[PDB]
Amino acid sequence: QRQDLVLFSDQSVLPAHFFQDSNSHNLFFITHQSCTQPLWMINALVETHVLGSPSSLNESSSSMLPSSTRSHAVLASFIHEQNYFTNSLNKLKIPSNNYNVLDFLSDFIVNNIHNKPRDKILSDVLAKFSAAIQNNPTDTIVIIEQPELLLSLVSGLTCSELNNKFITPLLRQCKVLIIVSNSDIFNIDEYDASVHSSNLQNFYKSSFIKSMINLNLNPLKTGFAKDVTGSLHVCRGGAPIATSNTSLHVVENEYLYLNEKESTKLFYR
Amino acid sequence: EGQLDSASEPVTGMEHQLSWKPQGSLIASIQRKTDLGEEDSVDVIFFERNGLRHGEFDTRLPLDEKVESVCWNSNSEALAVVLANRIQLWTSKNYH
Amino acid sequence: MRNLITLNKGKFKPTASTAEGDEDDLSFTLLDSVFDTLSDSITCVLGSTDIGAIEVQQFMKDGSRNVLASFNIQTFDDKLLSFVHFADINQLVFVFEQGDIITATYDPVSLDPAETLIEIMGTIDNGIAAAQWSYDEETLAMVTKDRNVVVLSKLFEPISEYHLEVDDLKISKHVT
Amino acid sequence: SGIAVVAVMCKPHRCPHIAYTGNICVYCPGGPDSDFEYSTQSYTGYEPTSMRAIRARYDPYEQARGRVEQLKQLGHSIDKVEYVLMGGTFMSLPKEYREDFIVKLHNALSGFNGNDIDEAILYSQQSLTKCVGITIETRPDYCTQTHLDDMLKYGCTRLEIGVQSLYEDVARDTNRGHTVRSVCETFAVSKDAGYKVVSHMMPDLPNVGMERDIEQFKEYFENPDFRTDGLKIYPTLVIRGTGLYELWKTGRYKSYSANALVDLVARILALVPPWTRIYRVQRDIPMPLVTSGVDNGNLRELALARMKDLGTTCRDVRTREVGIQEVHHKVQPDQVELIRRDYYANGGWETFLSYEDPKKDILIGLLRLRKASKKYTYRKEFTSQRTSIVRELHVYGSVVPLHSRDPRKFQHQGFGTLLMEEAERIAKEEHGSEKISVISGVGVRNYYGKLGYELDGPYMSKRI
Amino acid sequence: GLDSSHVGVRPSPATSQPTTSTGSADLDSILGHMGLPLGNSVLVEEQSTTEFHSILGKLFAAQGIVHNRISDSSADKTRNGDTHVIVLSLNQMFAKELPGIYKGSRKQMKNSEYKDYNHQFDITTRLMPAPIASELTFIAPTQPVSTILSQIEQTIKRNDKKLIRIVIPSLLHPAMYPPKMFESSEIIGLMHGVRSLVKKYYERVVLFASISIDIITPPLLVLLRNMFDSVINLEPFNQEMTEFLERVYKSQPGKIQHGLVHILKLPVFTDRGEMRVLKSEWAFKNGRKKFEIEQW
Amino acid sequence: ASSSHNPVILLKRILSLTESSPFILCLDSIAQTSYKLIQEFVHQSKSKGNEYPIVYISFETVNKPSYCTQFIDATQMDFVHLVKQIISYLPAATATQAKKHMVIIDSLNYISTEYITRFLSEIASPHCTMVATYHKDIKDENRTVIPDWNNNYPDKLTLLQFMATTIVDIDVVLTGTLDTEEVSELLNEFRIPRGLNNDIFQLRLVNKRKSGRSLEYDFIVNSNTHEYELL
Ligand code: SF4
């Protein structure tokens, strides 16, 4: 029943030579319907970057502690806190010391962003990663989680300023960037966000233009069943692949996935 | 949480062999029938979750055996019968 | 129309550990051997019940013998019913017939059992007829000799208790 | 063309299985004892056929003649009609009533005015407006060999024996007088006689869960005993006058929601073997008198949307039929092949032959063949040597256009001969038979008499 | 570590975690944990102008006071249970609105040892009497967010022993909340900081809130619904269905209901990737004793 | 005490002001204005043998009607003075349910939404009985909602519908050979076919009662013989 998870022509999810090529950049865009959460995919990405294989889906997860590995990993998010990241991701056993974890929720709201000039806020939030990645320059992967929420935090900010002040510098400085977000704004029944709420959707469209691969986790259609949870889509993003080899491209396939007790299963219709 | 759901239906000769089919259909147990006629044999009996009898099949063993445990495969294919010396594997196709 | 055929038939003998150079057995019989969770390991436990000594050691896929605990209980004639290991928090669970649930603690870097601690968490009086774990290693159900069944959590807290009775019979025949 | 279905009604009566259980089965609505009291059981008397039957005071001659003339006057011309009987248990009634009923039903079309049913059927064989069989409804307790001989003499071709469940508590708690296991021997004896057999099912019943509903259907389709040639699924709807409404009144009953039922139907339709014709998941109900349940007019209209979202769409006969002529010939079909399946069912081996398009899975023609066994046959025709029976011939391959160079002006008129000779080949080679027989309605006893089959008793047979 | 008092808590049958109880009859049953896990907030919603949910907004809070008031020389175990309930409203009528205990029965059977569990309640009976400011406090919402965020942290820090239960009665009611706070940044930052504080003290703090959605633009609702970890929606019947039920139901006054229940989000169950949305299956009813949720 | 009122009798009961709430909303358009509605109010209110003193607030009315006793014109003067002048002809006492000072408003389009509540929070006294009118078709001024990403505040219609205890709306029946589709087509062209501003109109009524529930009522109203019937 079970099927392998392949995302490239080289029969490998995350090619190693991507990290071996200098003067290059790449961007992944992941969208999940907010009735489900893509954590079980972030875990797989981190394991396959560090351990070199999907250590929860295709491989066993009994030695899942990538701490103090020759590689590196940096995760930052706004939706949750440092306490949740430590306690949970260590209960999920996501590494610590060869690893960086960044909160922007706990105690950050209380007059540390509020009632301060916007330019200083943007400069400092960029400098956090600009300084946290100086240690290991070329063997890290960085993922940001739902950054568009910050748009609603800053007093009167549009897509363009946030994008050109946060996203593009991050991808220029770092090798590869992964951005994950949710898409409820496009799923309000009998209401059009295109009336006056297009500012947020502009960010999604811009990111999809700039992205290289597009990962989609979407819920089932009309009803709810037991043996299947959701649908998994892989698509080619807007930007082309900045690699140096020529035969490389992206495989094109759709999966049906079930999640239960942190255990995920993928198969075909 | 430790509540009661149902209690089994009394049958004659039911031994201490208890095992559940992983798919979730039938309880497997061992019965010995020593009554008159030629019906006397050693059988395997299946019990629904409501404590109601359903299905049966006889082993061709002599009536003097002593079976220790009955094992369901990790899937719904193999049934392992455990004896003192021999261990037997049974599987079904077309309900036979 | 298919048939079943045999591919492999492997075997070995768990070698009991003693300080002697020849290092033969001490009438140590194995009580339980398990399938470890796909980590190329087989955790076995042996012992001598009359003197009251037990030993748990992992057999590696290559064949390297590693001992994590070898401890002697003060009492004897205490037969086991279920031993498991979580392999994520790295503890050990033993179920004895007298009523003691044994919780052992070990470290990965400690090759020798010198740092394996023991805990004798709350006893169940009047012995225990049987006990069993679930597939997910979360629910601990057991039955005492006095027709009382108790369900405990994964952290040794009581989910519930209930007195099994011959007078309880949900008959399949009511005349309504 | 001109296939016609003309339903008739029998006089009201009482099925005797009430006698040893006390009342009608719980789900049966209406009846003589109910307030209606001029109506056969399982029918409220408010159907159009009920109206046409009442005004004729339940007479077969008038009902048949009136329905035939109405259909002819509407704009269709009829030359092929199949009768279907309804209501209670027709076989319970005394001897003379059934004989007179059948003789009247045949003399309505034949134009004959005699008696001595043998002569009536003999004249009906040589008549215009041919009859293509009868459909008699009967219970397991009345399918003994004498009754089977009666039905064979009458001219019936297919039965429909309901089971309604496979569990054993349901039989006693629904006040239905037969153990489940006896239906298997009923099927075994019936099939060896050449009678196509169809059953009934009802998903929701008291003290039945969604699980048990699932694996009862799974066991029905998998077990080599419950393999039959048709099915009917009746979702449980609660009429006020039934014994089901009392349970809801006392609070001893509750039904399923809409989502649960649509999911159940979606799962069920994804398991049908490709030789069984799902008749009606969207059955016909007395609408306003139902008090509990859900709407059933478009269950499959949503189940199809469900299979399009989960995959593995239906594979029954009905969805794959192309018809006699130009139903879906708006597009030229694809590769045509012969597909032959074999299965073990009710103590015997049976073969299903079909002419199908494998790329898009449509159906053009089919044939069924059975190798007679030795532990169930009793007829003096089948107890003399080995023999095989063609239970059903079905040729929608009367299609004029086709794929892969259809006959120009011969237009598949010899298409059925292909299947007939194909059947004879394996009858001579594989079965090793010494006689082959085909069962058919009396009106079509000549489309088989040209290929060499000769008449013996109610059968069309030829040796090897 | 530090000292802590849990006013009442049992292991979660579903995942072996500390779980409190709202005091409800079937709402605690449908939360998946047979209760509310220690740390995850909840949300309940009503379609129309009715005020059914208001009743629930009382029960929870009252339960805590009981769980604190039946320990002072009224519980032989004298078990350490302390709560300091905080209410954010511009009207103080709640200070004299807690419903009365029916007969007690805080049994759970079917740091200290916590056996306390739900009580028996009835709506007609008022409480006897009501807590003093030392047990329960009111904060007006119209003050600037800086003062509120400082004061909540001060209250929790200065009362480290106590268990924390917070209730927000009818958040975003136009009769008390001015348009100058309907601006997008204000409320979302307020709740973002509230979630920060709540999960910071994950051991014992629990929060509860409810709003009205008929007068809220969908974008703000979407922004808000990701802040919490559980969403329950109550939709009352139309007039026609009510008249149909009353015309059909002639032998039962108690079988009359008011509407149905929809499940949009659950506790930790959902964060492991579980599709838990389930709508148009349950039915709610307000009653003389408690709040009933049954199948329809 | 009377309860479970006859729907026509209940319609009279509200129209006779046997019951009373500190806020009543009435809606009108350019197809049927509400002068005859006030006529019905005074016809079925003072027929009980009651005076019902009336205070008038005008934003669109030009002349002093016969209904009102006192007078105040609010076009020249503004909010900060109307909050004063409203109390001058309105005592702060109890009992809306009976003969008190009834404050009537002809139009509510010309007050900023940002201060709708600040207004209404200081008028609906337990002696005060408020009734107001709103023009449905007239589009709200673009500077009342601020359609930017900051302002999540609702519009004017929903705010009034959520706040008012009881809602009454009216529409004109076209006795002619036309259809309301053609009437809308011509009105979108700003054309008036013959048959508008009649006297036999249709009405829609909603009252919030029983802890918040509501029931919609429809009738047929003749404003000459004062005939209320079912539709
Ligand atoms: S056997 Fe048929 S006719 Fe008799 S009670 Fe049952 S359903 Fe009705």
Curated annotation (Swiss-Prot), chain A:
State the InterPro entries in the record: ELP6, P-loop_NTPase
User: Main site of residence?
Assistant: cytoplasm
UniProt-annotated location(s): Cytoplasm; Nucleus
Spell out the GO cellular component terms annotated for this protein, sorted alphabetically and separated by semicolons: cytoplasm; elongator holoenzyme complex; nucleoplasm
> How does the annotation summarize its subunit structure?
Component of the elongator complex which consists of ELP1/IKI3, ELP2, ELP3, ELP4, ELP5/IKI1 and ELP6. The elongator complex is composed of two copies of the Elp123 subcomplex (composed of ELP1/IKI3, ELP2 and ELP3) and two copies of the Elp456 subcomplex (composed of ELP4, ELP5/IKI1 and ELP6). The Elp123 subcomplex forms a two-lobed scaffold, which binds the Elp456 subcomplex asymmetrically. In each lobe, ELP2 is tightly sandwiched between ELP1/IKI3 and ELP3. The Elp123 subcomplex binds tRNA through ELP1/IKI3 and ELP3 and can bind 2 tRNAs simultaneously.
Q: Which GO terms describe its molecular function?
A: identical protein binding
Entry function:
Component of the elongator complex which is required for multiple tRNA modifications, including mcm5U (5-methoxycarbonylmethyl uridine), mcm5s2U (5-methoxycarbonylmethyl-2-thiouridine), and ncm5U (5-carbamoylmethyl uridine). The elongator complex catalyzes formation of carboxymethyluridine in the wobble base at position 34 in tRNAs. It functions as a gamma-toxin target (TOT); disruption of the complex confers resistance to Kluyveromyces lactis toxin zymocin (pGKL1 killer toxin). May also be involved in sensitivity to Pichia inositovora toxin.
Record gene name = ELP6
From Swiss-Prot, chain B:
Q: Any idea what a deletion of this gene does?
A: Loss of mcm5U (5-methoxycarbonylmethyl uridine) and ncm5U (5-carbamoylmethyl uridine) from tRNA.
Give a short account of its post-translational modification.
Phosphorylation promotes the tRNA modification function of the elongator complex.
The entry's localization annotation reads:
Cytoplasm; Nucleus
The record lists its disulfide bonds as: none
Additional detail: Present with 10500 molecules/cell in log phase SD medium.
Q: What does this protein do?
A: Component of the elongator complex which is required for multiple tRNA modifications, including mcm5U (5-methoxycarbonylmethyl uridine), mcm5s2U (5-methoxycarbonylmethyl-2-thiouridine), and ncm5U (5-carbamoylmethyl uridine). The elongator complex catalyzes formation of carboxymethyluridine in the wobble base at position 34 in tRNAs. Functions as a gamma-toxin target (TOT); disruption of the complex confers resistance to Kluyveromyces lactis toxin zymocin (pGKL1 killer toxin). May also be involved in sensitivity to Pichia inositovora toxin.
The protein depicted here goes by the name: Elongator complex protein 1
Q: Which organism is it from?
A: Saccharomyces cerevisiae (strain ATCC 204508 / S288c)
Shown chain mapped onto the complete sequence: 291 to 386 of 1349
UniProtKB/Swiss-Prot annotation, chain D:
Q: Where is this cross-link: Glycyl lysine isopeptide (Lys-Gly) (interchain with G-Cter in ubiquitin)?
A: 360
Null phenotype? Sensitive to caffeine and thermal stress. Resistance to zymocin.
Q: How is the cofactor bound?
A: Binds 1 [4Fe-4S] cluster. The cluster is coordinated with 3 cysteines and an exchangeable S-adenosyl-L-methionine. The cluster is required for structural integrity of the elongator complex, while it is not required for catalytic activity.
EC numbers on record: 2.3.1.311
One cellular component GO annotation, for this chain's record? nucleoplasm
The reaction(s) catalysed by this protein are: uridine(34) in tRNA + acetyl-CoA + S-adenosyl-L-methionine + H2O = 5-(carboxymethyl)uridine(34) in tRNA + 5'-deoxyadenosine + L-methionine + CoA + 2 H(+)
The molecular function terms in GO held by this entry are: 4 iron, 4 sulfur cluster binding; metal ion binding; tRNA binding; tRNA uridine(34) acetyltransferase activity
Q: Where is this chain primarily localised?
A: cytoplasm
* Binding locations of acetyl-CoA: 80, 392-395, 415-417, 448
Q: Which residues form the Radical SAM core domain?
A: 1-288
Q: Where in the cell is it found?
A: Cytoplasm; Nucleus
Q: Which cofactor does it need?
A: [4Fe-4S] cluster
Report the residue ranges that make up the N-acetyltransferase domain in this protein.
312-464
Q: Which residues form a coiled coil?
A: none
Pathway given for this chain reads: tRNA modification; 5-methoxycarbonylmethyl-2-thiouridine-tRNA biosynthesis
In the UniProt annotation, what is the result of changing residue 178 to A?
Answer: Decreased tRNA modification
Keywords attached to this Swiss-Prot or TrEMBL record, sorted alphabetically, are: 4Fe-4S, Acyltransferase, Cytoplasm, Iron, Iron-sulfur, Isopeptide bond, Metal-binding, Nucleus, Repeat, RNA-binding, S-adenosyl-L-methionine, Transferase, tRNA processing, tRNA-binding, Ubl conjugation
Further facts: Present with 4760 molecules/cell in log phase SD medium.
State the family named in the UniProt similarity comment for this chain.
Belongs to the ELP3 family.
Record-given protein name = Elongator complex protein 3
What organism, scientifically named, is this protein from?
Saccharomyces cerevisiae (strain ATCC 204508 / S288c)
Q: The organism's lineage?
A: Eukaryota, Fungi, Dikarya, Ascomycota, Saccharomycotina
From Swiss-Prot, chain E:
GO MF term (any one): identical protein binding
UniProt keyword annotations, A-Z: Cytoplasm, Methylation, Nucleus, Phosphoprotein, tRNA processing
Question: Annotated pathway, please?
Answer: tRNA modification; 5-methoxycarbonylmethyl-2-thiouridine-tRNA biosynthesis
Which locations, inside or outside the cell, does it occupy?
A: Cytoplasm; Nucleus
GO cellular component term of the entry, any: nucleoplasm
What spans are recorded as compositionally biased (Low complexity)?
Answer: 11-24
State the Gene Ontology BP annotations. Answer: regulation of transcription by RNA polymerase II; regulation of translation; tRNA wobble uridine modification
Classify the source by domain of life. Eukaryota
State whether keyword Transport applies.
no
Q: Which family does it belong to?
A: Belongs to the ELP4 family.
- Other known facts: Present with 358 molecules/cell in log phase SD medium.
How does the record describe its quaternary structure? Component of the elongator complex which consists of ELP1/IKI3, ELP2, ELP3, ELP4, ELP5/IKI1 and ELP6. The elongator complex is composed of two copies of the Elp123 subcomplex (composed of ELP1/IKI3, ELP2 and ELP3) and two copies of the Elp456 subcomplex (composed of ELP4, ELP5/IKI1 and ELP6). The Elp123 subcomplex forms a two-lobed scaffold, which binds the Elp456 subcomplex asymmetrically. In each lobe, ELP2 is tightly sandwiched between ELP1/IKI3 and ELP3. The Elp123 subcomplex binds tRNA through ELP1/IKI3 and ELP3 and can bind 2 tRNAs simultaneously.
The protein, known as: Elongator complex protein 4
Q: Organism source for this protein?
A: Saccharomyces cerevisiae (strain ATCC 204508 / S288c) (Baker's yeast)
Lineage of the species this protein comes from:
Eukaryota, Fungi, Dikarya, Ascomycota, Saccharomycotina
